[PDB]
Amino acid sequence: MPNIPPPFTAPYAPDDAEIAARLLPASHLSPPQEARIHRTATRLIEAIRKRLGGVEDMLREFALSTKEGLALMVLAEALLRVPDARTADQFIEDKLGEGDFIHHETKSTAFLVNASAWALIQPGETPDGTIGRLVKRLGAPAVRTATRQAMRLMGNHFVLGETIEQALERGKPRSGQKTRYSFDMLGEGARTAADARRYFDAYASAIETIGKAAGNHALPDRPGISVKLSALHPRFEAISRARVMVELVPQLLDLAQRAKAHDLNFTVDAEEADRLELSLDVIAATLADPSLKGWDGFGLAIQAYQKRASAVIDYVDALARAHDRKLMVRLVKGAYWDTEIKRAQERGLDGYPVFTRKAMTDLNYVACASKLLALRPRIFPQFATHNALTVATVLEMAEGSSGFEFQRLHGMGEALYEQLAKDHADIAYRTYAPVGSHRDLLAYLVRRLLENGANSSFVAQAADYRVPVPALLQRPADAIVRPQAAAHPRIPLPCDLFAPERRNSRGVEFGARTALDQLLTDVKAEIADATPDQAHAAVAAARAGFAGWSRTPAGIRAAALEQAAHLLESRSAHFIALLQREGGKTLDDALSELREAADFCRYYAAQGRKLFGSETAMPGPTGESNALTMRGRGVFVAISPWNFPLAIFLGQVTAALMAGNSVVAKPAEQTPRIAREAVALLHEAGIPKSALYLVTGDGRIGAALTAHPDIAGVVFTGSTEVARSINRALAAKDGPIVPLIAETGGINAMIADATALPEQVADDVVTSAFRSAGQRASALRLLFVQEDVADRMIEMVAGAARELKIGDPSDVATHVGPVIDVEAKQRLDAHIARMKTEARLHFAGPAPEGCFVAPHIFELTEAGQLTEEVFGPILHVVRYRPENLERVLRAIERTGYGLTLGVHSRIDDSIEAIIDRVQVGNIYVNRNMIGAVVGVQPFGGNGLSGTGPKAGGPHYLARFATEQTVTINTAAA
Amino acid sequence: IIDRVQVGNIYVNRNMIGAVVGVQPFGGNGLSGTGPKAGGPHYLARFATEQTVTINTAAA
Amino acid sequence: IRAAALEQAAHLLESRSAHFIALLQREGGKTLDDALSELREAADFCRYYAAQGRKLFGSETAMPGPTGESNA
Amino acid sequence: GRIGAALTAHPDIAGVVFTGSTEVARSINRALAAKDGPIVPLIAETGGINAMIADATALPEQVADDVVTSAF
Amino acid sequence: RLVKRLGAPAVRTATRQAMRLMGNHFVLGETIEQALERGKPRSGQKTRYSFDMLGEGARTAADARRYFDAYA
Amino acid sequence: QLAKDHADIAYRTYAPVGSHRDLLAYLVRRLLENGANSSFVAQAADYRVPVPALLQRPADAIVRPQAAAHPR
Ligand SMILES: Cc1cc2c(cc1C)N(C[C@H](O)[C@H](O)[C@H](O)COP(=O)(O)OP(=O)(O)OC[C@H]1O[C@@H](n3cnc4c(N)ncnc43)[C@H](O)[C@@H]1O)c1[nH]c(=O)[nH]c(=O)c1N2
Ligand SMILES: Cc1cc2c(cc1C)N(C[C@H](O)[C@H](O)[C@H](O)COP(=O)(O)OP(=O)(O)OC[C@H]1O[C@@H](n3cnc4c(N)ncnc43)[C@H](O)[C@@H]1O)c1[nH]c(=O)[nH]c(=O)c1N2
Ligand code: PRO
């Protein structure tokens, strides 16, 4: 036997043009080959257009957005499970579209997780909600018609139940009969340990159901089942690789053995690009087990839209050769394109793991198909596509042989493949039906609706009679023509996300083992207090340096900040090491703060040139010029917290510097070493020694600086109480009234209604409340959840919080590092002890020995029971009745804070009513509440959360400056 | 002189009074007050607070 | 609508300039040039803050950022 | 001024815009800082001891006009 | 051209739909007598619709007589 | 629907009646109104057009007499 291949590690995002330079000349097919492709594909499309309806047909017919399609399909599924069809019909006629629009949308969605939530109207009701807006746009009668069509789609193309047992019973064939379709199991991303067991049992149960109804033919002519690795493990991620290999591989092996005993086709689905390498590790370790010898049905899907696709085929082939197995290997284009684009941008990667032009995916798909056909008979390829051109092209390359199959999803490609079977008798195609429980439908529908609603989609275009048949027949190479056109011209690289305004900081893809190992390796390879006299001397020295720095040209100040950003990223490992050792930060938080620090420098520099680089001409009479400028105020005191000891330290300091002020900077007592390094870096980057001084020490040293009569302002990030005493010490002076800029935390809420996806709420609640041990001013402190989904949401958040690893922040697998010091831990433990006697406990995690606090979840009777910002991993939850959203919003107003607010809801009218009502500075809708990006989410709020202006936004720098008008009577000239 | 002083309104070779709204934004610093200048483009913002709305649109 | 109210206030001030000028002279002690000038300045404040008001509070500023996400 | 003080000391107001003497602006500022509620904005214009510099290249009759206007 | 753009099967479907429209919404014949016979109601029953007579722009004297007779 | 909501409503329905030699000329004109983009029946059947769009009253679309003639 040949060698087991090494762990898969292809380059993540190679250059598109170099890939196109090879694929474009090789795509050339001969004239008679291309003519047959043209004929096959024309006949296939003519059959598609012959005219059972589909999802895309419903979307097209009623001009529905994907949100509206989703709402109607959820309503449809609920209505199908009303015991009496006549009861459902009465509902559709008499109630649907008459009113209770948001109630119907909310109840029908709650039904998917809480079957008892829904059991089945004044006139003139304002049409709101997804359904009400649909009614205003189309009329209630069309909405009824659309809902009835969605009911036919949900009943014909999905195999669903309140439990997997009911789904499998509904999808059963008659005893002695084979199932006419394979099972694409619903289920992705276990959030809890209980989730992972349930999906395992569902899969095992489905394997027995399709096994008992499998016929007597050999492979390939036997049913299949499709499974997702993320469903089988609650932290399926590269940084948790060590536990995944120990925990997931036995689970996947157990299911594969159960599949083998029925001689089934067993397929591991392909998921996001940052899980490719981990999935191949798991798949290799499973396939290696000798219990799977003698069975030809094991396999996996490979996504052609990935630049690594061809290397994955090589890896899978060497795997099959090394263990002397036959594998069934599914080639798809890829279901997560939008996710991959967004992720690479957010993560500042140096490129995209996927192609960005559709024709490039189609080109690579045919090249990969040709590669897979040549690997027969060891590899049995399965070409999963509903594109008539792709099918015609793959068929022509096979040159009329067998040993492969096509694949489709129930409700798509039926006319395509029926016609193919008519014209080529030896054609096999496998049809999968989605099978699973209601609690897994929403997550599945969201992704299915993206492909069916995409404008570039082939099935959507082949069904629009506006698109001529010849348009759907252009071969990919003819659309790309030249390799330099491989990348999409309107999609910038992540490093160009803000061009030409400024550069972007670079991130790291943790799902690329080469990138993660280098980062871990680089990082692994890496103070007397001030007397009141030395602080007093620091002010005097900054005061003397003010005049020259103030008069230094803005472009020179900006150049210094941009060089500071350059040095930060060049020395990223040093600062990351400091953030981990001194700050206690996990590697993602440390990398993220380093990026934020560089982003602050570049953004304030760009803002700085705009604001202080030139004068504004004012209109006015002739013979007179009027020019408005802004100039530095004087000496700013900057006081910074320990929880962002580099980025907030540098944001405040470089803002004051950019506006032309000299700065005395007082860092938190707990984190002076990183502040010392940053100041030394700023001096090296071009900030004169006379313009910036560091003073370390106690709160009494911070007080002496802010009481000093010669300072011109204070920029402060910390607690409400210290901000007030600073404000009082400033107002007590007899000198000028100087600006105070303060950000002082929040008691930040999130509102989740029953239309939100519970697994996304859970993800975002876990992140917002427990990332960085809750040591973020933006962190979620108070979750409001509608009662109809509160049980499932609270239980999923608790199960997810239990899977967070707490420990040493330098370990790659850690999710929750220690809290800053013993005094912090003592404050948090006191609030925990108090809440245990005062409110319901849902989760109290196990904390390791040391300066750790584990995630906690408490449920309150009323929001009023939470009266302080508690700066730790401690979530509070209130469940509420949908009619009481006003009591919720008053509860949020009552705290006096207003920093962040999360809103999880499908309902735009609900989201908007919340935004209109609250004053909160940062509102995050259907995502987590943390990690504001400089120049993207200007960060800061009002009330007890501080003064503004927002850091990282366009109103920040001006507050550090004063205005000057120069009026010159020019008439003498 | 302009480079050296911090005064809010500098009038060269004319009188010092009667600032015109939107022409000479009026106001200064030190013991003369806080800013922003009345009748100028930075005035209104000081009476307001900022709000960022971030919507994950990916579901669409 | 707030801006319209300020512009209508400016319209009314100038339309009733004689009344306010008289008030500025009798109650304020202002000479006629100072009163007229302050009346003009009052109307100018209304129209200027109204125009600034539409620019500043009339619409949202879109922030750059990743695809799949809006920031306003 | 006691009624002005009651208004600026009221715990429900969200800011103060003030034009007058330095001394009163400071006491307003102190009454704001003394509150336990939010730190609210104070916008204050408080006068000046305004100078003029005239050198020997200036036209003395234009300096005179402008000094008389600006001071009286 | 319709076939190249939509495919012959869609053209067949469109033609069958046009056949339903022509049969349901038009009262036609090779002569007016056949149209009127096809558009007749049962003896003793009123026609559920009024007649918008086809016919415009006689080009010939024979045309004008034929349209007169059709109308009559 | 009108007859359902207002019982005293009368409407007359016409059918086209005539011979084949008159169909073409009739169809050409009928097809212009059914195929026109501005047509109400064409827009009320396109679900892309929201119901509120079809309800704008004519005066609100013209606003000013100088806009009566079509600008293009
Ligand atoms: C039986 C079966 C099983 C599966 C899958 C399909 C079927 C039929 N899929 C889904 C598959 O990847 C794909 O999303 C859809 O089938 C649509 O692709 P087509 O070839 O049908 O259509 P079509 O040819 O219209 O191609 C659409 C695809 O093109 C790509 N695309 C669109 N715009 C692009 C752009 N600007 N640049 C680059 N590429 C672009 C996307 O991948 C998109 O899905 C999947 N998917 C997956 O990721 N893992 C899996 O395990 C499976 N499993
Ligand atoms: C029973 C019956 C009998 C007849 C007629 C209709 C019916 C139902 N018609 C046809 C009629 O004049 C009209 O053409 C159609 O009925 C469509 O008009 P609506 O009010 O239905 O539709 P709709 O309200 O959509 O209005 C369409 C009409 O608007 C007008 N229009 C479109 N664009 C315009 C523009 N840019 N500027 C100005 N006007 C514009 C045109 O007149 C066009 O027909 C007719 N017609 C006729 O000329 N003589 C006749 O004897 C008859 N007889
Ligand atoms: O999506 C991922 O890759 C990880 C897995 C658990 C939470 N986020």
Ligand code: PRO
């Ligand atoms: O706001 C801050 O940064 C500090 C740290 C814990 C609570 N207050």
Ligand code: PRO
């Ligand atoms: O052992 C581990 O690594 C994980 C972390 C939390 C629960 N188990």
Ligand code: PRO
């Ligand atoms: O957005 C966040 O999570 C942190 C909190 C203060 C600014 N950045």
Ligand code: PRO
């Ligand atoms: O403090 C402020 O807001 C003023 C306005 C422009 C310059 N600084």
Ligand code: PRO
């Ligand atoms: O410029 C002037 O003379 C007056 C004084 C305050 C503002 N306008």
Ligand code: PRO
């Ligand atoms: O009070 C301020 O200065 C902030 C800046 C932008 C809006 N208001």
Ligand code: PRO
């Ligand atoms: O500044 C003012 O308006 C008052 C008048 C005299 C002293 N201070």
